[PDB]
Design a protein around this ligand. Structure first.
Ligand SMILES: Nc1nc2c(ncn2[C@@H]2O[C@H](COP(=O)(O)OP(=O)(O)OP(=O)(O)O)[C@@H](O)[C@H]2O)c(=O)[nH]1
Ligand SMILES: Nc1nc2c(ncn2[C@@H]2O[C@H](COP(=O)(O)OP(=O)(O)O)[C@@H](O)[C@H]2O)c(=O)[nH]1
Ligand SMILES: [Mg+2]
Lengths: 369, 430, 199, 77, 434, 49
């Protein structure tokens, strides 16, 4: 048949140096075999580990046999071509009409097959807004679009996948919302568009432009600071196992519908040593510290800032038990119950101490910024 | 620094030197226009050894082209690479040698040798610090054999310490190119032992054997043969141009290849030589290179080394190899052949390495051997010379320009004495 | 001294043998091999800015079928990357490698495009080129034993899968110019132009 | 020595299949001039040396300073 | 306020110094440029002198009679650090003849070398001694190095001199006239140097293979072990510790007699990047690995001779007792016997700075090791073989004519064999039991 | 003269720890409350189940 190949390197802790392995990928019967380029010794051979098809691609991570690998680059002619198709790019963006509908739009995106590679939190400042939409200066649509962008919070996303430049467009629906209902009732515009100026979301019309729009947002030299205020708020984290199971959107709306005013959703990549500095509050305390930490470094994770008249405990109520197993029987209508799986991979995690609410939210949004 | 000077003569010398300059220019990046199209910065740091520079920037060879007849010098210029030479370094006569010593070394050459000597001295005084002179000349040829030896004698007399190299295409036992081959042959070696420092015989017959037995070209041409000797010469001077782990100079070999003052006859070889067909089917390992270089047929001398002994020899490796492989193979070759190397000398095999190999090849070596096998070469030439001197053949020509039969007498005595003293060590034991 | 030039170098020169020898080998692949290098260029450059990164060039180059040694790549990148800005325009790469374009050939190439658009009223489509041509006109540039029935298969395969893909005039010259490099004579290439297009 | 003989000037093809045919076959594939180009000059470098793998390796003396161990750059605590 | 002066000569000397200075520079945070950002104890005065603001300069003296290798140091990866004029270069090569490198061409570089060394000494304030690396089986090192040692002695006197010589091996060597080069160098060094270490080529190969599973090494790999041994030897002078060792404490501790002062060294443990973390590498076993016959860096069998004096310098987080436990273990072991007149013949120092590994090295990170630099009468064999070779090849004046022409006298060779025979007799006599 | 760095430097280490004690002890106590919160939190649910 056909075989897929990859190059893998592992950053041990006991051994200072970093090796380079193979991780052969038999597509016929879902098997994983790993070989090392150096010293010519068969490393791991012909045993399935049940890795989903879509996981393999450059930049991601996957954990196997207590050792967590990171494919760095491709190896041979055939491997590149098969997946090289999935590298196209496009910038998404949602205007402040659907701020109360943030959770849903996230959900439907995952169905199409695209990916939410990154996402941040910004309120478009008036000064640097003008540099954006530069090509729209001449038309009267400029002035109308100027203020609306600066009114309220905005959410920006980057989609990585096939035909994202257009596949985003077709699902995203025609520009004017009103016309969408007559022709495309089942489209983004159809369900959440009021008028032309309040069109729900947007897409990049041109690739060459598509490069431009992002360099404004996720580039290191960016004029969009993470707007937020660090008073009277409690932080919760979507643990990594969720972003793999495709319910990130579903978890978001549930908290929003409870009367909580969401302010931001952002993605952070943090390695093993950094993670341990977050759960030190549980370092030797009750929760059997060692097991949990190692998972949080098994993939990305979204961070959520939440607010309410009473921050810490109230949000905890709907989050009114550490183990989901007890949650199902006696609190079926709690967040943890619906999505929790086991003792150590329990969905959401919100602060459970009154006086430390400010710092934990600050750490995700002040120190690591 | 420590640049060298090259002197060639006769038609054979002209061809060999022209092809050597071709290969050297190709490797160092010098093109027919004489301009620089080099790629690696490592291609100019020691360029001055074989080239000079002047205003304009077209690098020039410091060679000498000369002979007693105008045709050969005329032919070399007309071909490609003929525009690199200084137009001044063409010194030529107007009569021709005709395969008679006296017409080359006493009257005509004496009339002409002054210009060549003057040009050589000017080039030497110009060069910063001399290292030695290497000469390509044919003993069997008329003009070169005689007046070339006069040139060598004069140069050595003028410079006491600089070392002299000598490449000699001696006649072959079977394929002969002259009815009077030994006269200009034996006497030349008679006169060469006292002055020349390093002599490395090259045999035409071996080239044909080596060619049709390994290279496998159906119809070889002189251009092909010249290329092998050219590569040998190019490799002879590797470390002096390029850096490496353990550099070696010409003097090092002399202190390492000349146990006695009068035994300075060496035989050379090249590898790996492979036909155009099997190039990709054979590995390139230190082991595979070892067997070929000692391969009895691969040696360029007419006499097969398996009929004598080995006193001293050096192998100058080029390219990136691992020293560990180099030394172990040397021990294997010196041990598993318990009787091929004189027993009173310990570790009679030389090693060397350079960190830049010739373009277009992975790794190759040049083998230099002080082998007693050469005794057959001299004995055969001397035997034929005595056989044809028993009858005073052709003597009237030689006696007609200041040559007396007794001078010929001295040469044959020198030849026989050299043969006997050189053969003594084969039976001599510690 | 006017009679004596100073040669020297004031501007970088194309390395040459690294570039030319690519021309010789790339000849043997086939008529559409030259097109193969261009396509592989676009496919790697799925971002539409104008070039490929440092390593990807290795990826892009090592797909057509040239496993050049490092220096072979070493010389080429220095000449192409003027100031090591981090990117080298691939468009220039193709213009230098394939060969040279004569004004008449480009003029002839444009004329056929106008004629093809004339029958369709100024519109372009791969269906028209697929529907009308001489598959035997490729025989003139190099003979072959393949059946004419399969030849049409190669023409569609080397083209895009969809039959309604947009085609630009600048693309038309580039597409044929890729073919021309395989032919060794200008007269032979243009006669294919008439024979293939019946003009 | 009875080479040559039953094969005259012919370009391409399997030849006459007599004697030592295989060895010279590749050459004509490599380039022009099957043998001893008549008097299309034959480059002497083509025959004797063989296939060319053109590259100049590094000095191998300048290999000391260059060395990197990525595992020393982690942010750690 | 303590420093040392390093003397490097010869091709092998230059290459070994390259690795030694690589390790030294990496061990102190000074990047190749010469700037040390750190991010401050005066631990860098031992080998480097502050230049006024940032950049440093190593107290190095480089000599070679050929421009090939000297130039590469000026065009490689360290072209902005070394002093522009402290890299002395020659004009012509010695060509592996001792006479050439000792009387005609070697006498027109001694003045410049003495000038540079005088400036180095004057700038230095607490010069502890000299460290010299030179090769004897070659041209430049044997002659130029020996003459330099002679001049240094005659100039300074009581200053100690340590020599990490590079002698030939039993069966693996490059030169065909190497033996002659050795005897004269030994005759010169025996009466002017204090401490020397045999570091033959052959032994290093065996250790490299049998430990690092690298069957195709190169000189570069061998250089790193020598650099590590030098670094471990000299660390105590500059890094803090509990039981310090001063280079002064080798002349008065590891040379029973003024004439017999030849000693052979070893280094371990040497474990690759795979066989590193799955063993114990404890203090107890490492010591036993140091005294194994095959581990030593010189092709000299220890089991064929008595031991007369041994010194060990531990490094890392060793606890003192485990030093004592190992000492007692080796002492009790019957396989090893000590000379009849050395009741207490160990002198151990303990340091604190852990061993450091150069990047991309074959040596994986370790936390303990011992650098045995002991001395033993077993070295008699190495001098036996060279003397036998000299006799065999000088029996009938082979290769002699080269030497007599350069200036050397015919009768000089008589003296060298005389001194070598005297030294052999001294070694044989000293080891006898009371 | 060089002793000033040691006198001033030695000051840096000793104070650093002292400041640490307040950081830890202040950090220790909050460790005490958390165990109480979950414990009593867990105890109830044993009855409730
Ligand atoms: N182990 C080891 N030995 C070396 C190295 N470099 C040189 N040598 C020794 O040097 C000897 C050969 O001498 P040379 O390379 O000519 O150096 P030299 O002794 O200074 O003589 P010169 O040619 O004048 O430089 C060999 O037998 C080696 O033992 C090296 O990098 N590692
Ligand atoms: N291999 C080879 N040998 C040559 C060539 N030209 C001449 N010779 C040899 O040189 C000898 C003739 O020497 P020649 O040039 O006439 O010297 P001259 O007689 O002094 O002029 C012949 O025996 C040939 O074997 C050549 O191109 N290749
Ligand atoms: Mg030298």
């Amino acid at each position: 048949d056909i075989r897929y190949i990859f190059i893998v390197e592992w950053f041990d802790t006991a051994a200072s140096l970093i090796r380079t392995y193979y991780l052969t990928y038999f597509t016929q019967d879902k098997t994983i075999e790993m070989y090392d380029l150096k010293n010519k010794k068969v490393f791991l051979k012909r045993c399935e580990y049940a890795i989903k098809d879509s996981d393999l691609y450059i930049g991601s991570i996957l954990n196997v046999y207590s050792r967590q690998l990171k494919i760095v680059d491709f190896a041979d002619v055939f491997t590149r071509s098969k997946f090289q198709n999935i590298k196209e790019k496009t910038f998404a963006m949602i205007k402040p009409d659907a701020y109360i509908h943030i959770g849903k739009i996230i959900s439907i995106i995952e169905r199409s097959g695209l990916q939410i590679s990154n996402l941040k939190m910004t309120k478009m400042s008036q000064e640097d807004a003008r540099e954006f939409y530069g090509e729209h200066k001449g038309k009267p649509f400029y002035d109308g679009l100027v203020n609306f962008m600066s009114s309220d919070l905005i959410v920006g996303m980057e989609l990585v996948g096939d035909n994202a430049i257009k596949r985003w467009r077709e699902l995203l629906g025609p520009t004017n919302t009103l016309v969408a209902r007559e022709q495309a009732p089942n489209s983004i515009r159809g369900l959440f568009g009021t008028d032309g100026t309040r069109n729900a979301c947007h897409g990049s019309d041109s690739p060459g432009s598509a490069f431009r729009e992002l360099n404004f947002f996720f580039a290191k030299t960016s004029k969009l600071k993470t707007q937020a205020f660090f008073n009277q708020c409690t932080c919760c984290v979507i643990k990594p196992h969720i972003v793999k199971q495709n319910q990130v959107g579903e978890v978001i709306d549930m908290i929003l519908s409870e009367g909580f005013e969401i302010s931001a959703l952002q993605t952070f990549f943090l390695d093993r040593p950094t993670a341990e500095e977050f759960y030190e509050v549980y370092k030797g305390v009750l929760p059997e510290f060692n097991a949990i930490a190692e998972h949080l470094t098994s993939g990305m994770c979204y961070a959520l800032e939440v607010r309410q008249e009473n921050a810490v405990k109230s949000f905890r109520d709907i989050a009114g038990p550490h183990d989901p197993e007890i949650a199902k029987v006696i609190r079926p209508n709690t967040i943890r119950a619906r999505f929790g799986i086991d003792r150590v991979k329990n969905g959401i995690h919100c602060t459970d101490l009154e006086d430390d609410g400010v710092l934990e939210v600050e750490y995700f949004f002040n120190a690591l910024q | 620094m420590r640049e060298i000077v090259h002197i060639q003569g006769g038609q054979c010398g002209n061809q060999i030197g022209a092809k050597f300059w071709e290969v050297i220019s190709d490797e160092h990046g010098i093109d027919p226009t004489g301009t620089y199209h080099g790629d690696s910065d490592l291609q100019l740091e020691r360029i001055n050894v074989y080239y000079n520079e002047a205003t304009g920037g077209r690098y020039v060879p410091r060679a000498i082209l000369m002979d007693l007849e105008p045709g050969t010098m005329d032919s070399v210029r007309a071909g490609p690479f003929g525009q690199l030479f200084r137009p001044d370094n063409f010194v030529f006569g107007q009569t021709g040698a005709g395969n008679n010593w006296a017409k080359g070394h006493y009257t005509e050459g004496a009339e002409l040798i002054d210009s060549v000597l003057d040009v050589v001295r000017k080039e030497a005084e110009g060069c910063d610090c001399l290292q030695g002179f290497q000469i390509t000349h044919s003993l069997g040829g008329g003009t070169g054999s005689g007046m070339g030896t006069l040139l060598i004698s004069k140069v050595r007399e003028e410079y006491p310490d600089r070392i002299m190299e000598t490449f000699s295409v001696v006649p072959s036992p079977k394929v002969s190119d002259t009815v009077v081959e030994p006269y200009n042959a034996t006497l030349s070696v008679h006169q060469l032992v006292e002055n020349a420092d390093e002599c490395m015989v090259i045999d035409n017959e071996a080239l044909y054997d080596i060619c049709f037995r390994t290279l496998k070209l159906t119809t070889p041409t002189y251009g092909d043969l010249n290329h092998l000797v050219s590569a040998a010469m190019s490799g002879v001077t590797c470390c002096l141009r390029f850096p490496g782990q353990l550099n070696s100079d010409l003097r090092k070999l002399a202190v390492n290849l000349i146990p006695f003052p009068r035994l300075h006859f060496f035989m050379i070889g090249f590898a790996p030589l492979t036909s155009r067909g099997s190039q990709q089917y054979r590995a390139l390992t230190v082991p595979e290179l070892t067997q070929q270089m000692f391969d009895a047929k691969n040696m360029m001398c007419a006499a097969d080394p398996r009929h004598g002994r080995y006193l001293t020899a050096s192998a100058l490796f080029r390219g990136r190899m691992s020293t560990k492989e180099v030394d172990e193979q040397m021990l294997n070759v010196q041990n598993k052949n318990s009787s091929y190397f004189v027993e009173w000398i310990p570790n009679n095999i030389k090693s060397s390495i350079c960190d830049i190999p010739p373009k277009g090849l992975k790794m190759a070596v040049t083998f230099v051997g002080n082998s007693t096998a050469i005794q057959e070469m001299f004995k055969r030439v001397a035997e034929q010379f005595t056989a044809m001197f028993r009858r005073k053949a052709f003597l009237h020509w030689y006696t007609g320009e200041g040559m007396d039969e007794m001078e010929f007498t001295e040469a044959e005595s020198n030849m026989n004495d050299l043969v006997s003293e050189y053969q003594q060590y084969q039976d001599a034991t510690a | 001294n006017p009679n004596v030039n100073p040669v020297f170098k004031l501007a970088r020169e194309v390395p040459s043998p690294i570039i030319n020898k690519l021309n010789a080998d790339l000849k043997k692949q086939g008529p559409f091999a030259f097109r193969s290098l261009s396509k592989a260029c676009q496919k790697a450059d799925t971002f539409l800015n104008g070039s490929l990164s440092h390593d990807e060039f290795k990826w892009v180059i090592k797909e057509i079928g040239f496993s050049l040694t490092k220096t072979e790549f070493d010389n080429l990148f220095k000449f192409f990357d003027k100031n090591y800005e981090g990117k080298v325009i691939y468009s220039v790469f193709i213009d230098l490698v394939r060969g040279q374009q004569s004004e008449i050939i480009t003029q002839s190439l444009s004329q056929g495009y106008d004629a093809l658009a004339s029958n369709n009223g100024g519109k372009v489509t791969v269906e028209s080129i697929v529907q009308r041509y001489n598959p035997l006109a490729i025989q003139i540039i190099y003979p072959t034993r393949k059946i004419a029935q399969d030849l049409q298969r190669e023409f569609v395969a080397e083209w895009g899968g969809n039959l309604q893909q947009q085609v630009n005039k600048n693309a038309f010259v580039e597409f044929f110019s890729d073919v021309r490099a395989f032919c060794d004579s200008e007269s032979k290439f243009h006669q294919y132009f008439s024979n293939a297009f019946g003009l | 020595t009875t080479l040559e003989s039953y094969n005259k000037q012919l370009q391409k093809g399997q030849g006459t299949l007599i004697g030592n045919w295989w060895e010279e076959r590749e050459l004509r594939d490599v380039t022009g001039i099957g043998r001893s180009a008549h008097n299309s000059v034959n480059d002497t470098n083509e025959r004797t040396m063989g296939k060319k793998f053109n590259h100049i390796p590094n000095t191998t003396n300048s290999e000391y300073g260059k060395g990197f161990n990525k595992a020393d750059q982690l942010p750690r605590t | 306020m303590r420093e040392v002066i390093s003397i490097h000569v010869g091709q092998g000397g230059i290459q070994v110094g390259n690795a030694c200075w690589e390790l030294f520079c990496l061990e102190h945070g000074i990047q190749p440029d010469g700037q040390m950002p750190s991010d401050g104890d005066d631990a860098f005065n031992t080998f480097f002198s502050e230049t006024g603001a940032g950049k440093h300069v190593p107290r190095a003296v480089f000599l070679d009679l050929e421009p090939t290798v000297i130039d590469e140091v000026r065009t490689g990866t360290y072209r902005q650090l070394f002093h522009p004029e402290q890299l002395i270069s020659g004009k012509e090569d010695a060509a592996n003849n001792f006479a050439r490198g000792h009387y005609t061409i070697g006498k027109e570089i001694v003045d410049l070398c003495l000038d540079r060394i005088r400036k180095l000494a004057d700038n230095c304030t607490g010069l502890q001694g000299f460290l010299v690396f030179n090769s004897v089986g070659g041209g430049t090192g044997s002659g130029l190095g020996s003459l330099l040692l002679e001049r240094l002695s005659v100039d300074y006197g009581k200053k100690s001199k340590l020599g990490f010589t590079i002698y030939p091996s039993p069966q693996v060597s490059t030169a065909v006239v190497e033996p002659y080069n050795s005897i004269l160098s030994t005759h010169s060094l025996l009466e002017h140097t204090d401490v020397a270490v045999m570091l033959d080529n052959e032994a290093i190969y065996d250790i490299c293979r049998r430990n690092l599973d690298i069957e195709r090494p190169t000189y570069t790999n061998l250089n790193r072990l020598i650099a590590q041994v030098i670094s471990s030897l000299t660390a105590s002078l500059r890094f803090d510790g509990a039981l310090n060792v001063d280079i002064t404490e080798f002349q008065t501790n590891l040379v029973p007699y003024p004439r017999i002062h030849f000693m052979l060294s070893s280094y371990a443990p040497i474990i690759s990047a795979e066989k590193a973390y799955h063993e114990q590498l404890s203090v107890a076993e490492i010591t036993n690995s140091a005294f194994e016959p095959a581990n030593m860096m010189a092709k000299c069998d220890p089991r064929h001779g008595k031991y007369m004096a041994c010194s060990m310098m531990y490094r890392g987080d060793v606890v003192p007792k485990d030093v004592n436990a190992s000492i007692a273990t080796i002492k009790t072991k019957r396989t090893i016997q000590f000379v009849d007149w050395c009741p207490t013949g160990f002198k151990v120092g303990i340091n604190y700075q852990p061993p450091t590994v150069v990047p991309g090295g074959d040596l994986a990170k370790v936390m303990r090791a011992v650098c045995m630099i002991s001395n033993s009468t077993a070295i008699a064999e190495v001098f036996s073989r060279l003397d036998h070779k000299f006799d065999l090849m000088y029996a009938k004046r082979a290769f002699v004519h080269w030497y007599v022409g350069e200036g050397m006298e015919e009768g000089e060779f008589s003296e060298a064999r005389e001194d070598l025979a005297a030294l052999e007799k001294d070694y044989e006599e000293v080891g006898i039991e009371t | 003269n060089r002793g000033k760095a040691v006198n001033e430097g030695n000051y840096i280490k000793q104070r650093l720890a002292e400041l640490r004690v307040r950081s830890q002890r202040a950090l220790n106590e909050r460790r005490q409350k958390l165990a109480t919160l979950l414990g009593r939190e867990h105890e109830q649910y044993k009855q409730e189940i």
